[PDB]
Amino acid sequence: GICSSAPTLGEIWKRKLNQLDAKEFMAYRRRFVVSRGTAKLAWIDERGGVELKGTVVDLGCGRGSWSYYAASQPNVREVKAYTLGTSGHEKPRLVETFGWNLITFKSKVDVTKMEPFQADTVLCDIGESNPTAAVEASRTLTVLNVISRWLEYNQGCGFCVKVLNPYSCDVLEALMKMQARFGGGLIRVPLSRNSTHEMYFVSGIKNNIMGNVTAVSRQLLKRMEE
């Protein structure tokens, strides 16, 4: 059922991606593809994928693009942003914005160990691409398990969460369980490069997760022959 087709197609996409040489990879990744991070959240926002409101938590905020964006939105009251920011990782970048005083950045935080607290909107763009899909899958599952406790703690909240590898069988199963508990759906942002299969688990759109994952694999494969 759930794992009959999607893991196969995604793994073909990954193995074919990994066979592209430097010039091929550069040409492919941009083919028909529409800061990159701000633009992605903005696109999801404008399509109704997440109601940005109340207290917004940004888990793994990095340089803070999503936090700055959320803090500029009219129904947002506060942004609490957390990131690792230690050696090797992105740390919050300070900019002069009218939303400046709505944001609190906290560095040296392991968000996998933070207890959940009140949030009207849960945002998380965590997931570092890796050539091994299994590595990406365990990263994706870690993010989803973390996000589950926030969505359970905050019944009815909005959310927009990156799913780095959405075609792995264990990820699909975790996603079906989450859609069952918390509703929502899984969307592809057209600004995403063809070199990532990243999709976003969002509160404001209801859809067929498996069908969308497979449609994305088939589109990314098609673009690779074009």
29: nearest Cα among 190, 194, 188: 194
The residues, any chain, with a CB within 8 Å of residue 46's CB and separated by 6 or more, are none
187: nearest Cα among 176, 169, 175, 201: 201
Do residues 120 and 154 touch, judged by C-beta distance below 8 A? yes
How many whole angstroms separate alpha carbon 226 and alpha carbon 129? 23
Do residues 26 and 34 touch, judged by C-beta distance below 8 A? no
How many whole angstroms separate alpha carbon 215 and alpha carbon 87? 38
The residues, any chain, with a CB within 8 Å of residue 110's CB and separated by 6 or more, are 84
- Give the DSSP per-residue string, the chain: -TTSSHHHHHHHHHHHHHT--HHHHHHHHHTT---HHHHHHHHHHHTTS----EEEEEET-TTSHHHHHHTTSTTEEEEEEE---STTS--PPP---TTGGGEEEE-S--TTTPPP---SEEEE------SSHHHHHHHHHHHHHHHHHHHHHSTT-EEEEEES---SHHHHHHHHHHHHHH--EEE--TTS-TT---EEEESS----HHHHHHHHHHHHHHHH--
CB burial class (10 A; 0-12, 13-18, 19+) of residue 46?
Answer: exposed
Amino acid found at 199? M
Beta-bridged to residue 161, according to DSSP, are 124, 201
Other beta carbons within 10 Å of 112: 13
Query: Which resolution in angstroms does this entry have?
Result: 2.0
How many whole angstroms separate alpha carbon 56 and alpha carbon 68? 11
200: nearest Cα among 187, 182, 219, 209: 187
CATH homologous superfamily of 1-226: Vaccinia Virus protein VP39 (3.40.50.150)
How many whole angstroms separate alpha carbon 25 and alpha carbon 28? 5
Give the CA distances from residue 82 to residues 49, 58, 61, 108, 151, in Å, rounded to whole numbers and listed in that order: 22, 6, 6, 8, 17
Beta-bridged to residue 201, according to DSSP, are 161, 186
Q: How many residues does the chain have?
A: 226
Other beta carbons within 10 Å of 156: 9
Exposure class string for 9-27: b at 16+ Cβ within 10 A, else e: bbbebbeebeeeeeeeeee
> Binding site for S-adenosyl-L-methionine: residue ranges?
66, 110-111
Exposure class string for 69-91: b at 16+ Cβ within 10 A, else e: bbbbbeebebbbbbbbbeeeeeb
Lookup result for tokens 């995403």: 192
Q: How many CA atoms lie within 13 A of 33 on its CB side?
A: 19
> Binding site: residue ranges?
66, 110-111
Do residues 63 and 129 touch, judged by C-beta distance below 8 A? no
| Angle, alpha carbons 219-225-226 (nearest 5°) | 85
Do residues 157 and 122 touch, judged by C-beta distance below 8 A? yes
